[PDB]
Coordinates of C-alpha atoms in Angstrom, one line a residue:
Chain A
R1 CA -42.9 -10.1 23.5
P2 CA -39.9 -9.2 25.7
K3 CA -40.7 -12.2 28.4
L4 CA -40.9 -14.7 25.5
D5 CA -37.6 -13.4 23.7
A6 CA -35.5 -13.1 26.6
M7 CA -36.5 -16.9 27.3
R8 CA -35.6 -17.6 23.8
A9 CA -32.1 -16.1 23.9
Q10 CA -31.6 -17.3 27.4
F11 CA -31.8 -21.3 25.6
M12 CA -29.8 -20.2 22.6
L13 CA -27.5 -19.5 24.8
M14 CA -27.5 -23.2 26.8
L15 CA -27.8 -24.7 23.8
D16 CA -24.5 -23.2 22.1
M17 CA -22.5 -24.3 25.9
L18 CA -24.0 -27.5 24.5
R19 CA -22.3 -27.1 21.1
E20 CA -18.8 -25.6 22.1
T21 CA -19.1 -29.0 24.4
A22 CA -19.5 -31.0 21.2
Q23 CA -17.2 -29.6 19.4
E24 CA -14.1 -30.1 21.6
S25 CA -15.3 -33.5 22.8
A26 CA -15.4 -34.1 19.2
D27 CA -11.7 -32.5 18.1
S28 CA -10.3 -34.7 21.1
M29 CA -11.9 -37.3 18.7
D30 CA -10.7 -36.4 15.8
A31 CA -6.7 -36.0 17.5
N32 CA -7.8 -39.4 18.3
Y33 CA -8.8 -41.0 14.7
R34 CA -5.8 -39.9 12.9
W35 CA -3.5 -40.5 15.7
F36 CA -4.0 -44.1 14.8
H37 CA -5.7 -43.9 11.3
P38 CA -2.8 -41.3 9.7
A39 CA -3.8 -40.6 5.6
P40 CA -1.9 -42.3 3.5
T41 CA 0.7 -39.7 2.0
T42 CA 1.2 -39.1 5.2
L43 CA 3.0 -42.8 6.1
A44 CA 5.5 -42.0 4.6
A45 CA 7.4 -41.5 8.3
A46 CA 8.3 -45.1 8.0
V47 CA 10.0 -44.9 11.5
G48 CA 9.0 -44.3 15.3
Chain B
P1 CA 20.0 -36.0 -21.1
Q2 CA 19.3 -32.3 -19.1
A3 CA 19.9 -31.5 -16.2
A4 CA 19.2 -28.6 -13.8
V5 CA 21.9 -27.7 -11.4
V6 CA 19.5 -26.2 -8.5
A7 CA 21.1 -24.4 -5.0
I8 CA 18.8 -26.0 -2.3
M9 CA 17.8 -24.6 0.7
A10 CA 17.1 -26.7 4.0
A11 CA 17.5 -26.2 7.7
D12 CA 19.6 -22.9 7.5
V13 CA 21.8 -24.4 4.8
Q14 CA 21.5 -23.6 1.0
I15 CA 23.7 -26.5 -1.1
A16 CA 24.3 -26.6 -4.6
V17 CA 23.4 -30.0 -6.4
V18 CA 22.5 -31.1 -10.1
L19 CA 19.8 -32.8 -10.2
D20 CA 17.9 -34.8 -13.2
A21 CA 16.1 -31.9 -15.6
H22 CA 13.0 -34.2 -16.1
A23 CA 12.5 -37.8 -13.3
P24 CA 8.9 -36.8 -11.4
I25 CA 9.7 -35.2 -8.0
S26 CA 8.5 -38.0 -6.3
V27 CA 11.3 -40.1 -7.7
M28 CA 14.5 -37.7 -6.0
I29 CA 13.0 -36.2 -3.0
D30 CA 14.0 -39.1 -0.8
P31 CA 17.2 -39.5 -1.3
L32 CA 17.5 -35.7 -1.8
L33 CA 16.8 -35.5 1.8
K34 CA 19.1 -39.0 2.3
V35 CA 22.3 -36.4 0.8
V36 CA 20.9 -33.7 3.3
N37 CA 20.8 -34.8 6.2
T38 CA 24.1 -36.9 5.6
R39 CA 25.3 -33.1 4.0
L40 CA 23.7 -31.0 7.8
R41 CA 24.8 -34.3 10.1
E42 CA 29.3 -33.8 8.2
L43 CA 28.5 -29.7 9.2
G44 CA 28.0 -31.2 12.9
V45 CA 23.7 -29.5 12.3
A46 CA 20.9 -31.0 13.1
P47 CA 19.2 -32.7 10.6
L48 CA 16.1 -32.9 9.5
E49 CA 13.2 -34.1 11.4
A50 CA 9.8 -35.3 10.1
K51 CA 7.5 -33.3 12.7
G52 CA 4.5 -35.4 13.8
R53 CA 2.3 -36.3 10.1
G54 CA 2.6 -35.0 7.4
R55 CA 5.2 -35.0 4.2
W56 CA 8.3 -33.9 2.9
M57 CA 8.0 -31.5 -0.5
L58 CA 9.8 -29.2 -1.5
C59 CA 9.0 -25.2 -3.2
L60 CA 9.9 -22.4 -4.8
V61 CA 11.3 -20.2 -2.6
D62 CA 8.4 -18.0 -3.5
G63 CA 6.9 -20.4 -1.6
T64 CA 4.9 -23.2 -3.8
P65 CA 5.5 -26.2 -3.6
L66 CA 6.0 -28.0 -6.4
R67 CA 4.2 -30.9 -8.1
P68 CA 5.5 -34.1 -6.8
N69 CA 3.6 -35.6 -9.7
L70 CA 5.7 -33.2 -12.6
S71 CA 8.7 -33.6 -13.0
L72 CA 11.1 -30.3 -13.2
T73 CA 11.1 -29.4 -16.3
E74 CA 7.3 -29.3 -17.2
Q75 CA 7.1 -27.2 -14.0
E76 CA 9.6 -24.8 -15.3
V77 CA 12.5 -25.4 -12.9
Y78 CA 15.7 -24.3 -15.3
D79 CA 19.1 -24.3 -13.9
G80 CA 20.1 -21.9 -11.7
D81 CA 16.4 -21.8 -9.6
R82 CA 16.7 -21.9 -5.9
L83 CA 14.1 -24.7 -3.8
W84 CA 13.3 -25.0 -0.9
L85 CA 12.5 -28.9 1.1
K86 CA 9.7 -28.9 4.0
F87 CA 8.2 -31.2 6.0
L88 CA 4.7 -29.7 5.2
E89 CA 2.7 -30.4 8.2
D90 CA -1.0 -32.1 7.6
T91 CA -3.6 -30.2 7.0
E92 CA -6.0 -32.5 7.4
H93 CA -9.0 -32.4 10.3
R94 CA -12.4 -32.8 11.2
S95 CA -14.4 -30.1 9.1
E96 CA -16.7 -28.6 11.8
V97 CA -20.0 -27.4 11.9
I98 CA -22.2 -24.6 13.8
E99 CA -26.2 -25.2 12.4
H100 CA -27.3 -22.7 13.9
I101 CA -26.8 -19.4 11.3
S102 CA -26.2 -16.4 13.5
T103 CA -23.6 -17.8 15.8
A104 CA -22.1 -19.4 12.3
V105 CA -22.5 -15.8 11.2
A106 CA -20.6 -14.7 13.6
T107 CA -17.9 -17.0 14.2
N108 CA -17.1 -16.6 10.5
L109 CA -16.8 -12.9 10.0
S110 CA -15.2 -13.1 13.9
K111 CA -12.3 -15.8 13.0
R112 CA -11.9 -14.5 9.8
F113 CA -11.7 -10.5 9.5
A114 CA -10.1 -7.7 12.2
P115 CA -12.2 -5.8 14.5
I116 CA -11.1 -1.8 15.4
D117 CA -8.4 -2.1 17.7
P118 CA -7.5 1.2 19.3
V119 CA -3.5 1.0 17.9
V120 CA -5.7 1.2 15.1
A121 CA -7.6 4.3 16.7
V122 CA -4.9 6.3 17.5
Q123 CA -4.1 5.9 14.2
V124 CA -7.2 7.2 12.6
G125 CA -7.3 10.4 14.7
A126 CA -3.9 11.5 13.8
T127 CA -5.2 11.2 10.3
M128 CA -8.7 13.2 10.7
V129 CA -6.5 15.4 13.2
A130 CA -4.2 16.1 10.0
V131 CA -6.5 16.1 7.2
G132 CA -7.9 19.1 9.8
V133 CA -5.3 21.0 10.1
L134 CA -4.4 20.7 6.3
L135 CA -8.2 22.2 5.7
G136 CA -7.7 24.8 7.9
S137 CA -3.8 26.1 6.7
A138 CA -5.3 26.0 3.2
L139 CA -8.6 27.8 4.0
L140 CA -6.2 30.6 6.2
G141 CA -4.1 30.6 2.9
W142 CA -7.2 31.1 0.7
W143 CA -8.3 34.7 3.0
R144 CA -4.6 35.4 3.1
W145 CA -5.4 35.1 -0.6
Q146 CA -8.4 36.9 -1.3
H147 CA -8.2 39.3 1.6
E148 CA -5.5 42.0 2.8
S149 CA -6.0 40.4 6.4
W150 CA -3.0 40.5 8.7
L151 CA -5.1 38.3 11.5
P152 CA -4.8 34.9 9.7
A153 CA -0.9 34.8 10.1
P154 CA -1.3 34.6 14.4
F155 CA -4.1 32.0 13.6
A156 CA -1.4 29.6 11.1
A157 CA 1.7 30.2 14.0
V158 CA -0.4 29.3 16.9
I159 CA -1.9 26.5 15.5
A160 CA 1.3 25.9 14.4
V161 CA 2.8 25.7 17.0
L162 CA 0.3 23.9 19.3
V163 CA 0.4 20.4 17.2
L164 CA 4.2 20.9 16.8
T165 CA 4.8 20.9 20.4
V166 CA 1.9 18.2 20.6
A167 CA 4.2 15.7 17.7
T168 CA 7.2 16.0 19.5
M169 CA 6.1 15.5 23.1
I170 CA 4.5 12.1 21.7
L171 CA 7.6 11.5 19.6
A172 CA 9.5 12.0 22.7
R173 CA 7.2 9.9 25.4
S174 CA 5.8 7.4 23.3
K175 CA 9.1 6.5 20.8
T176 CA 8.6 3.0 22.6
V177 CA 6.3 1.6 20.0
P178 CA 6.0 1.6 15.7
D179 CA 3.0 4.0 16.5
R180 CA 5.4 6.7 16.8
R181 CA 3.8 6.9 13.4
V182 CA 1.1 9.0 14.8
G183 CA 3.6 11.9 15.9
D184 CA 5.1 11.2 12.2
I185 CA 1.3 12.1 11.0
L186 CA 1.7 14.8 12.9
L187 CA 4.7 16.4 12.3
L188 CA 4.2 16.3 8.2
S189 CA 0.6 18.4 8.7
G190 CA 2.0 20.7 11.2
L191 CA 4.9 21.8 9.3
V192 CA 2.1 23.2 6.5
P193 CA 0.5 25.9 8.9
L194 CA 4.2 26.7 9.7
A195 CA 4.6 27.1 6.1
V196 CA 1.2 30.1 6.0
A197 CA 1.8 31.7 8.7
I198 CA 5.6 32.6 7.4
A199 CA 3.8 34.0 4.1
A200 CA 1.3 35.4 5.1
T201 CA 3.8 37.6 7.5
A202 CA 4.5 39.0 3.4
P203 CA 3.2 42.8 3.7
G204 CA 1.2 44.3 0.0
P205 CA -0.7 41.7 -2.0
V206 CA -0.3 38.1 -1.9
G207 CA 1.8 36.5 -5.2
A208 CA 5.5 35.4 -5.6
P209 CA 7.3 36.5 -2.7
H210 CA 5.1 35.1 0.0
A211 CA 5.2 31.9 -2.3
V212 CA 8.9 31.6 -2.1
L213 CA 8.9 32.8 1.4
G214 CA 6.5 29.8 2.4
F215 CA 8.6 27.3 0.0
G216 CA 11.5 27.9 1.2
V217 CA 10.6 27.7 4.8
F218 CA 8.7 24.5 4.5
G219 CA 11.9 23.0 2.4
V220 CA 13.8 24.0 5.2
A221 CA 11.7 22.6 8.2
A222 CA 11.6 18.9 6.0
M223 CA 15.6 19.1 5.3
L224 CA 15.9 19.3 8.9
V225 CA 13.3 16.4 10.0
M226 CA 15.8 14.1 7.5
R227 CA 18.7 15.1 10.3
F228 CA 16.3 14.6 13.3
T229 CA 14.4 11.6 13.1
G230 CA 15.4 10.1 9.7
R231 CA 12.0 8.8 9.3
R232 CA 9.3 8.5 7.0
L233 CA 11.8 10.0 4.5
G234 CA 9.9 9.2 0.6
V235 CA 7.2 11.7 1.5
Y236 CA 9.4 14.9 2.8
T237 CA 12.0 14.0 -0.3
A238 CA 9.1 14.8 -2.4
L239 CA 8.5 17.5 -0.6
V240 CA 11.5 18.8 -0.7
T241 CA 11.7 18.4 -4.5
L242 CA 9.1 20.8 -4.7
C243 CA 9.9 23.5 -2.6
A244 CA 13.2 24.0 -4.0
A245 CA 11.7 23.9 -7.2
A246 CA 9.4 26.7 -5.9
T247 CA 12.1 29.1 -4.1
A248 CA 14.0 28.6 -7.3
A249 CA 10.8 29.8 -8.8
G250 CA 10.0 33.0 -6.2
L251 CA 13.5 33.8 -6.3
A252 CA 13.5 34.3 -10.3
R253 CA 10.1 36.2 -10.7
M254 CA 11.7 38.7 -7.2
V255 CA 15.3 38.9 -8.2
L256 CA 14.4 39.1 -12.0
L257 CA 11.0 39.5 -13.7
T258 CA 10.9 36.8 -16.2
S259 CA 8.2 35.4 -17.9
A260 CA 6.6 32.4 -16.7
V261 CA 7.1 30.3 -19.7
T262 CA 11.1 30.8 -19.4
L263 CA 10.4 29.4 -15.9
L264 CA 8.8 26.5 -17.0
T265 CA 10.6 25.7 -19.4
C266 CA 13.9 25.9 -17.2
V267 CA 11.6 23.8 -14.2
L268 CA 11.7 21.0 -17.4
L269 CA 15.3 20.7 -18.1
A270 CA 16.2 20.8 -14.0
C271 CA 13.4 17.8 -13.9
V272 CA 15.0 16.3 -16.7
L273 CA 18.3 16.9 -16.2
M274 CA 17.5 15.2 -12.5
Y275 CA 15.6 12.1 -13.5
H276 CA 18.9 11.5 -15.6
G277 CA 20.6 12.6 -12.2
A278 CA 18.7 10.5 -9.6
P279 CA 19.8 7.0 -8.8
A280 CA 23.1 8.7 -8.1
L281 CA 21.9 11.6 -6.4
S282 CA 20.1 8.7 -4.6
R283 CA 23.0 6.5 -3.7
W284 CA 24.4 9.4 -2.4
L285 CA 21.6 10.1 0.1
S286 CA 22.0 6.9 1.3
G287 CA 24.6 7.2 3.8
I288 CA 23.9 10.6 5.3
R289 CA 24.2 8.7 8.7
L290 CA 20.8 10.5 9.6
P291 CA 19.5 8.2 12.8
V292 CA 18.4 4.8 12.4
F293 CA 14.8 3.9 12.8
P294 CA 14.0 0.9 10.4
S295 CA 11.4 0.3 8.2
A296 CA 8.7 -1.6 8.1
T297 CA 10.8 -4.6 5.6
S298 CA 14.4 -4.5 8.0
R299 CA 11.8 -4.6 11.4
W300 CA 10.1 -7.7 9.9
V301 CA 13.5 -9.3 8.7
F302 CA 15.0 -7.7 12.2
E303 CA 12.3 -9.7 13.6
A304 CA 13.9 -13.4 11.9
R305 CA 17.4 -13.0 12.8
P306 CA 19.3 -12.1 15.7
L307 CA 31.9 -5.3 7.8
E308 CA 31.3 -9.0 8.7
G309 CA 28.7 -10.3 10.9
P310 CA 25.6 -9.2 11.7
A311 CA 26.4 -5.0 11.7
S312 CA 27.4 -5.4 8.2
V313 CA 24.0 -7.2 7.3
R314 CA 22.4 -4.7 9.4
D315 CA 23.6 -0.8 7.3
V316 CA 24.0 -2.7 4.1
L317 CA 19.8 -3.4 4.5
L318 CA 19.3 0.1 5.8
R319 CA 21.4 1.7 3.7
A320 CA 19.9 0.0 0.6
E321 CA 16.3 1.1 2.1
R322 CA 17.0 4.2 2.7
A323 CA 18.4 4.5 -0.6
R324 CA 15.1 3.0 -2.2
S325 CA 13.0 5.3 -0.6
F326 CA 15.3 8.6 -1.5
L327 CA 14.5 7.7 -5.0
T328 CA 11.1 6.2 -5.1
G329 CA 10.8 9.8 -3.3
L330 CA 12.6 12.2 -5.8
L331 CA 11.1 10.3 -8.8
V332 CA 6.9 11.7 -7.4
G333 CA 8.6 14.8 -7.3
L334 CA 10.1 15.0 -10.4
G335 CA 6.8 13.6 -11.4
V336 CA 4.6 16.3 -10.3
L337 CA 7.2 18.6 -11.0
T338 CA 7.0 17.6 -14.9
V339 CA 2.9 17.7 -15.1
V340 CA 2.9 20.9 -13.4
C341 CA 5.7 22.5 -16.1
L342 CA 4.0 21.0 -19.3
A343 CA 0.6 22.4 -17.9
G344 CA 1.3 25.5 -17.3
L345 CA 3.2 25.6 -21.2
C346 CA 0.4 23.8 -23.0
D347 CA -2.1 26.7 -23.1
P348 CA -4.4 26.4 -26.4
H349 CA -4.8 30.0 -27.7
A350 CA -0.9 30.8 -27.9
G351 CA 0.6 31.0 -31.2
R352 CA 3.6 28.9 -30.5
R353 CA 1.2 26.3 -29.0
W354 CA 2.5 23.5 -30.8
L355 CA 6.2 23.6 -29.5
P356 CA 5.0 22.5 -26.3
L357 CA 3.1 19.5 -27.6
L358 CA 6.3 18.3 -29.5
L359 CA 7.8 18.7 -25.7
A360 CA 5.7 16.9 -23.8
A361 CA 6.1 13.6 -26.6
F362 CA 9.6 14.2 -26.1
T363 CA 9.1 14.2 -22.7
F364 CA 6.7 11.3 -22.7
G365 CA 9.2 9.1 -24.0
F366 CA 12.0 9.8 -22.0
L367 CA 9.8 9.3 -19.2
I368 CA 9.4 5.5 -21.2
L369 CA 12.5 4.9 -21.0
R370 CA 13.0 5.0 -17.1
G371 CA 9.3 3.3 -16.5
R372 CA 10.9 0.2 -18.7
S373 CA 14.4 0.3 -16.8
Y374 CA 14.7 1.1 -12.6
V375 CA 13.3 -2.0 -10.6
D376 CA 11.3 -1.4 -8.0
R377 CA 7.7 -2.0 -8.7
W378 CA 6.6 1.8 -7.6
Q379 CA 9.3 3.5 -8.8
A380 CA 8.4 2.0 -12.8
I381 CA 4.5 2.9 -12.2
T382 CA 5.5 6.3 -10.9
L383 CA 7.4 7.3 -14.3
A384 CA 4.3 6.0 -16.1
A385 CA 2.0 7.7 -14.0
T386 CA 3.3 10.7 -14.6
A387 CA 3.6 9.9 -18.4
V388 CA 0.0 9.0 -18.8
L389 CA -0.5 12.8 -16.8
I390 CA 1.2 14.7 -19.1
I391 CA -0.9 13.8 -21.7
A392 CA -3.9 13.7 -19.3
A393 CA -2.9 17.6 -18.1
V394 CA -2.2 18.9 -21.3
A395 CA -5.6 17.9 -23.0
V396 CA -6.9 19.0 -20.4
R397 CA -5.3 22.4 -20.3
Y398 CA -6.8 22.5 -24.0
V399 CA -9.9 21.1 -24.2
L400 CA -11.2 22.9 -20.6
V401 CA -11.1 27.1 -21.6
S402 CA -10.7 26.5 -25.6
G403 CA -14.6 26.6 -26.9
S404 CA -14.5 24.0 -29.8
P405 CA -16.0 20.6 -30.4
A406 CA -13.0 20.1 -32.9
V407 CA -11.0 20.4 -29.6
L408 CA -12.9 18.5 -27.9
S409 CA -13.0 15.9 -30.1
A410 CA -9.7 14.9 -30.2
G411 CA -8.6 14.9 -26.6
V412 CA -11.6 12.7 -25.8
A413 CA -10.6 10.5 -28.5
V414 CA -6.3 11.0 -28.0
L415 CA -7.7 10.1 -24.2
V416 CA -9.1 6.6 -24.7
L417 CA -6.9 5.4 -27.3
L418 CA -3.7 6.1 -25.5
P419 CA -3.7 4.4 -22.1
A420 CA -5.2 1.8 -24.2
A421 CA -2.1 1.8 -26.3
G422 CA -0.7 1.7 -22.9
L423 CA -2.1 -1.9 -21.6
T424 CA -1.6 -3.7 -25.4
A425 CA 2.5 -2.9 -25.2
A426 CA 1.7 -5.8 -22.3
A427 CA -1.6 -7.3 -22.7
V428 CA -1.2 -8.9 -26.0
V429 CA 2.7 -8.8 -26.4
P430 CA 3.7 -12.3 -25.0
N431 CA 5.1 -11.4 -21.7
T432 CA 6.1 -8.2 -23.5
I433 CA 9.1 -10.2 -24.5
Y434 CA 10.8 -7.9 -27.4
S435 CA 14.2 -8.7 -29.4
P436 CA 17.1 -6.9 -27.5
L437 CA 17.9 -5.0 -30.6
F438 CA 14.4 -3.7 -30.9
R439 CA 15.2 -3.1 -27.4
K440 CA 18.4 -1.1 -27.7
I441 CA 16.2 0.3 -30.8
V442 CA 13.6 1.9 -28.9
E443 CA 15.4 3.1 -25.9
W444 CA 17.7 5.0 -29.2
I445 CA 14.5 7.0 -30.3
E446 CA 13.3 7.7 -26.5
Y447 CA 17.4 8.8 -26.2
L448 CA 16.6 10.9 -29.9
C449 CA 14.2 12.1 -28.1
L450 CA 15.8 14.1 -25.6
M451 CA 19.1 15.9 -27.5
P452 CA 16.0 18.3 -29.3
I453 CA 14.9 19.5 -25.5
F454 CA 18.0 21.5 -25.4
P455 CA 17.4 23.4 -28.4
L456 CA 13.7 24.1 -27.7
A457 CA 14.3 25.2 -24.1
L458 CA 16.5 27.9 -26.0
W459 CA 13.6 28.7 -28.7
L460 CA 11.0 28.3 -25.8
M461 CA 13.4 30.8 -23.5
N462 CA 13.5 33.2 -26.3
Chain C
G1 CA -41.9 -25.4 4.5
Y2 CA -42.7 -23.0 0.4
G3 CA -45.4 -20.7 -0.7
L4 CA -47.6 -18.2 1.2
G5 CA -49.0 -21.0 2.9
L6 CA -50.3 -19.2 6.4
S7 CA -48.2 -18.5 10.1
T8 CA -49.1 -18.3 13.6
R9 CA -48.3 -14.8 15.2
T10 CA -46.1 -16.6 17.9
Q11 CA -44.2 -17.5 14.4
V12 CA -43.6 -14.1 13.3
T13 CA -42.5 -13.5 17.0
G14 CA -39.8 -16.4 16.6
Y15 CA -38.7 -14.6 13.3
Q16 CA -38.7 -11.4 14.2
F17 CA -36.2 -12.9 16.9
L18 CA -34.2 -14.4 15.0
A19 CA -33.2 -11.4 13.3
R20 CA -32.7 -9.9 15.6
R21 CA -29.8 -12.1 16.6
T22 CA -28.8 -12.7 13.3
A23 CA -28.4 -8.7 13.0
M24 CA -26.8 -8.4 16.3
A25 CA -23.9 -11.2 15.1
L26 CA -23.1 -9.4 12.0
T27 CA -22.4 -5.6 13.3
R28 CA -21.0 -7.3 16.4
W29 CA -19.5 -11.0 17.1
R30 CA -21.5 -12.3 19.7
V31 CA -24.9 -13.4 20.4
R32 CA -25.1 -13.4 24.3
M33 CA -28.3 -11.4 23.8
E34 CA -29.0 -10.1 27.7
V35 CA -29.5 -7.1 26.5
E36 CA -30.1 -5.4 23.0
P37 CA -29.2 -1.8 22.2
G38 CA -30.3 -2.5 18.4
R39 CA -34.2 -2.5 20.0
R40 CA -33.1 0.5 22.3
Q41 CA -32.4 2.7 19.1
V42 CA -35.0 1.3 16.7
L43 CA -37.6 2.4 19.8
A44 CA -36.0 5.9 20.3
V45 CA -36.2 5.9 16.0
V46 CA -40.0 5.1 16.4
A47 CA -40.4 7.9 19.5
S48 CA -38.7 10.3 16.8
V49 CA -41.6 9.5 14.5
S50 CA -44.8 9.2 16.2
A51 CA -43.8 12.8 17.8
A52 CA -43.1 14.2 14.3
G53 CA -47.2 12.7 14.0
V54 CA -48.0 14.0 17.3
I55 CA -46.7 17.7 16.4
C56 CA -48.5 17.0 12.5
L57 CA -51.8 16.9 14.7
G58 CA -51.3 19.2 16.5
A59 CA -50.8 21.6 13.6
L60 CA -53.9 20.7 12.0
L61 CA -56.5 21.9 15.2
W62 CA -55.7 25.6 14.2
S63 CA -57.9 27.7 11.8

């Protein structure tokens, strides 16, 4: 049991590192898309 | 049609405008922005700018945005109101997801609540050592009440001097932070063992001489800490009020041999007089040029800003907050004194018992005057609380030692019905609206409660 | 997987692991789990209980 539980924990932390990498990628995609595609309400900037 | 004159504020300038009272906000917001930008540009002030994606919006000064699809009328914008113009930053973004339950729990809690921190930890330690030293001082007072030993007074003196020197060293060395309230807590905590140490040096059986000596020295120390520190002054104001009354009672029991009832009725009279005098006295105490450590609201105004100019507004603000704190401390001290005297008067097994219940009712109404009259939330709540506590204290003072179902049923019934009436006056009554005439008549009735106290004060004195 | 269906011992330990990891995520706000004092102190509890049991048996042998 203890060795297996250590292996589990280790794998899970690796998966967390991947998840945060996905998070930062998704944040970049979000910022890009909303820059190209503002919400209709926000279009009242109308300049620049 | 109707029009609302309102002063809008935008980019550190307030401008009075006359607005169509029932055009929707969506209609007027754009040319209002154009007019504001024109006025700012005319003033040489940098105009408003749309910081990225977002929208221009108007808020009440409390912060809530107005309904753009709705007019001023149906959202209760009246004449003489004020509005705050803003460009609201865009809210929308990707709604993130953490699929694993454990990591989602951990990240949500960590994001949304506050951990323990050493800043908090030092305050907790100060609070717990304050509680400990009050237990120790009260315990030594209990022992000297029970036993005639001279030896408790050295223990009280030594613990007092240790904690007072520690508080002084913390206040001197670590004055640089608003966590000097650790020192304030220790000083408040350590004045009490000093008071019981001085009180326990009075020889013979414990009583009035010990009481007058301890309360006098504790009130004197509480008066000194005003001029030397000037911090956390409401609690010291309440304490010096209580010590002034207790010292007046102790001198009345030593210089004279007056009865307890005479003194309690004197104390009640002093209370209702002081309630009448308290706001004026507070405005006096507002300007005693004590040291100028700012309080929380004043600090958090000062962080947002840099008889004329800044020093005038700063003096005005500090003066007003010192007034508010003194007034609140005074009212709390009077509230305690009022309930303790009414509790002391209403013994059930006395022949005159009907009279102090009238004194209770008159004081109850008189206090409710001030409660409806005084502006600060926590002062109105103070007055209401003490007024209720009058009734509760006299009720229990009867029903505990008067072993009868009659008084029990009477007390418990009024004890549940009376606060429900007190609630009812605002819960069902629409926004507590009454006519000004009816209000003034209620003010007359609870004023007409006062002048019966004067002859009753004479009659219970003799 | 509703109901009282069968489960393997590897799932029993897998659930107990996720329970401990969630407990650590609840009391602390970290899930790095390379060491875990929760287990260590419940083992200390187990030591307390087993010692009380042992002494209770050692008490039984007297007559």
